[PDB]
Structure formats: structure tokens, C-alpha cells
């Protein structure tokens, strides 16, 4: 719905060679949205865009390490 995604589009907020924050921001956004939805009684499907973008941009080991830390309670980012 409103998707049909090929890959993460150009984001004017991150126009330079260093894309580290682009990955990080979308990872955060997806998880913040996922928590809002699961909490207030709504659907995680609205959080889809962020999931696709961070999935396309973020290295597997980063996503993996971050997931592990959120589970351990050591994720330094605010979610």
C-alpha cells in the first residue's frame, strides 16, 4: 500500500558519502514506530517504510548487534 519499493531513495537529510546516520535514523524510526503501534493498540504495518529503508541500507552485522543490545537492555539509542 503506497509501496512497490525498489530501494531506499535519495534522502536530502543525508546527501553525502557518509550514510551511517541514514541507516541509524531509519533503524531508530522503525523501532520507535513499532513500539508506538504495539503499545497504543494499532498496526505495525505503518512502520513498514522505515523497515524497508533500514533493511536496504544497514549492514547485517549492525542490525544484528543492535537487535541483540535492545534485547539485553544495552541499546544506547532512545527508543
Amino acid at each position: 500500500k503506497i509501496k512497490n519499493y525498489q530501494t531506499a531513495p535519495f534522502d536530502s537529510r543525508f546527501p553525502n558519502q557518509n550514510q551511517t546516520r541514514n541507516c541509524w535514523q531509519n533503524y531508530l524510526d522503525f523501532h520507535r514506530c513499532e513500539k508506538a503501534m504495539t503499545a497504543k493498540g494499532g498496526d505495525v504495518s505503518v512502520c513498514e517504510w522505515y523497515r524497508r529503508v533500514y533493511k536496504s541500507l544497514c549492514p547485517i552485522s549492525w542490525v544484528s548487534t543492535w537487535d541483540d543490545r535492545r534485547a539485553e537492555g544495552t541499546f544506547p539509542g532512545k527508543i
Binding site: 530501494t7 535519495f10 546527501p15 558519502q17 557518509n18 550514510q19 541500507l57 544497514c58 549492514p59 547485517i60
Partner: protein, 227 residues
């Protein structure tokens, strides 16, 4: 790839690399001119019995050899900067692929739709198949669709490395904890080689990069079969 006795750049595979060839031709002409001129004048100053050892005035000829060089530098900078910004232009890719450097091999990840990933190691010289290139072949190549704008994201999981493909005009350092972006676009199908370009220890010389450019349709079946 480079061939025996090559003098200049590998043949341009992308529009940007073509652009650089022309810019290099332009600049190299200038380099030849100035170096030969200097060599010339040296020989000119040394081939005469005529002398003039008294004090010579400088605030006049110094204007010439200050303004001319400045103009020549601007003549180089203009096309240099035009290409630099052109490389930077927003292109909007159809695909995103990531590569992680490791001691000593590269791994690739195509995670736009499916979670596809694999390691890419150099084929040992003893295991090369007849006709294959020593130090250049890898077990798993980087299959990519030709004639499409692709976003390459480069990083590392240990020390620094550098992902390069001379034919496409590419070189982006692989730094741990950082995600470097570059765009790739091959005008032709084929196999394009590159080698790790940042000293990463013992096997820095042995962790090549091999891109395999095929039509989109073949890229898609390859991705499926690679899951």
C-alpha cells in the same frame, strides 16, 4: 583489467571513467608541456658562452611567471571540479548493495527485498582453472545488472580496507563503524576487476573484487538461485 605492457588507464566502463580519461588527457598535455619547457630552458641557459653576471631586475618577469601558472591552474581546476560535482549529482539508484571488508576477503549483501549475502575469496593460484587470472579471480563474483544506477555501500568489520574497481573509476575506503556510499553504472556487460586498496595486513595483496555485469533478467534469476 590491465593487460601486459599497459601505459595508461584501463578502458572506461562507465560514463564517469570516460570523463576522467578526457580530463587526464587534458592535464597530461599540460604536464608534458611544462616539463619539456623547463628541460628546454635548462638546456638553453647552459649552451652559450655569452654572459651577463651583473644584477638583473625581477619585478617584471615575475608577473609573467605568476600570472601564466595561475591561469593554467584555473584551466585544470574548472574541468576537474565540473567532474567532481557531476559525480556527486543525485542519481536515484534502482538497487543498493553493501560490501564489508574483512581480513582477507569481501562479503556482499543485497538486502533490498531478500536477505542475500555471501563471502568472496580469491581463487588460490594452485586452484586456478586454465585461462583464469592469477591473484584476480574470486570464488563468488558480484553479479550486478548492467546499464542501471546502483548504490554501493562500503564498510568493514575489522581493519581498514578499500573497495576499488579501476575500470568504473571507483575507490571507496572501507572503515569499520562507517557506511561509505558510491554509485556504480556499467555501460557494458562483462567482468570488471579491482583489488583491496588500503593496507590491511598480511594478505592485503590477495583479496580482489570481481563484478559480473549481466542483463537485469539474468540478475534476477541469479539472486533467486543465490538465496
Amino acid at each position: 583489467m590491465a593487460y601486459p605492457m599497459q601505459l595508461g588507464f584501463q578502458d572506461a566502463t562507465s560514463p564517469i571513467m570516460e570523463e576522467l580519461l578526457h580530463f587526464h588527457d587534458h592535464t597530461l598535455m599540460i604536464v608534458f608541456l611544462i616539463s619539456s619547457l623547463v628541460l628546454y630552458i635548462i638546456s638553453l641557459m647552459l649552451t652559450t658562452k655569452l654572459t651577463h653576471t651583473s644584477t638583473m631586475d625581477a619585478q617584471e618577469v615575475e608577473t609573467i611567471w605568476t600570472i601564466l601558472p595561475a591561469i593554467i591552474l584555473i584551466l585544470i581546476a574548472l574541468p576537474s571540479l565540473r567532474i567532481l560535482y557531476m559525480m556527486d549529482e543525485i542519481n536515484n539508484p534502482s538497487l543498493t548493495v553493501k560490501t564489508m571488508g574483512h581480513q582477507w576477503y569481501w562479503s556482499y549483501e543485497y538486502t533490498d527485498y531478500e536477505d542475500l549475502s555471501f563471502d568472496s575469496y580469491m581463487i588460490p593460484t594452485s586452484e586456478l582453472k586454465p585461462g583464469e587470472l592469477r591473484l584476480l579471480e574470486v570464488d563468488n563474483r558480484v553479479v550486478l545488472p548492467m546499464e542501471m544506477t546502483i548504490r554501493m555501500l562500503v564498510s568493514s568489520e575489522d581493519v581498514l580496507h578499500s573497495w576499488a574497481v579501476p575500470s568504473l573509476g571507483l575507490k571507496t575506503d572501507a572503515i569499520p563503524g562507517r557506511l561509505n556510499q558510491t554509485t556504480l553504472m556499467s555501460s557494458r556487460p562483462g567482468l570488471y576487476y579491482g583489488q583491496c586498496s588500503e593496507i590491511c595486513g598480511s594478505n592485503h595483496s590477495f583479496m580482489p573484487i570481481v563484478l559480473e555485469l549481466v542483463p537485469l533478467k539474468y540478475f534476477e534469476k541469479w539472486s533467486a538461485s543465490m538465496l
